[PDB]
Design a binder for these strands. Sequence first.
DNA 1: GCTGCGCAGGG
DNA 2: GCCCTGGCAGC
Length: 254
Amino acid sequence: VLKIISWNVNGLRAVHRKGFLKWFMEEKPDILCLQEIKAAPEQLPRKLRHVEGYRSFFTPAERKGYSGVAMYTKVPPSSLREGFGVERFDTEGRIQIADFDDFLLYNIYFPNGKMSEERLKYKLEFYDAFLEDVNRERDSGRNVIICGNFNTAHREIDLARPKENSNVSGFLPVERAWIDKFIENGYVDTFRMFNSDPGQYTWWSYRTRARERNVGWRLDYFFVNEEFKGKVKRSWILSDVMGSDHCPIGLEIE
DNA sequence: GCTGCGCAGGG
DNA sequence: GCCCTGGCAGC
Ligand code: NA
């Protein structure tokens, strides 16, 4: 069995101060995917950049302290692809696509759309490019695993306050519609393969002590193509892990 | 973003 | 009446 963990750290240096490595060796993921590291590798202390036992790959945004994704993996991929072939998406440090023989692993930090009409438009177009990219790789005979911060809660059950948020990027019908669309192309929300209950969240606002009162959303997901779901054994939320406004999620396969 | 609040329809 | 849906300063 291969354990993969995904975590929108919201600043890899910041989380390093708040027990990152201690936990890292504590959870022992086969693969560790990180989103929103807000760093370039040149900014990271040796023992944070290079964790013993793992190969590490970093893809920072062009812009400083912004976005960025990272992957640590005991067994290296035979290729890491850091983009979809669309410059405006490929320069924000949002994409890592690792080829691990059995599957392709997409580590994606999808755009947040709250800031502006442009940032939602960017978000929705990024969603479109990903779907095409993953569909092309899946239509060609590959199994795919997609993890990361989609920045959208799919259904009213996937957030504490569904009604007040229907007008705000993150729960817009256009955004929820796209997740339906994703699933109808033959992709499975692995968490809801085993768990249909409320109160399962993955992010909470820092403002209003939102986390201790479990007022949050499930914005982080593990998707696999429908041909691959029979290889998934568990999908769970690591709710007790602190450090970010997000908590880790996990997957184990075969 | 969450939590209040005033306000306005229903019902 | 009351409830319980549906712009905003305060954080
Ligand atoms: Na590995």
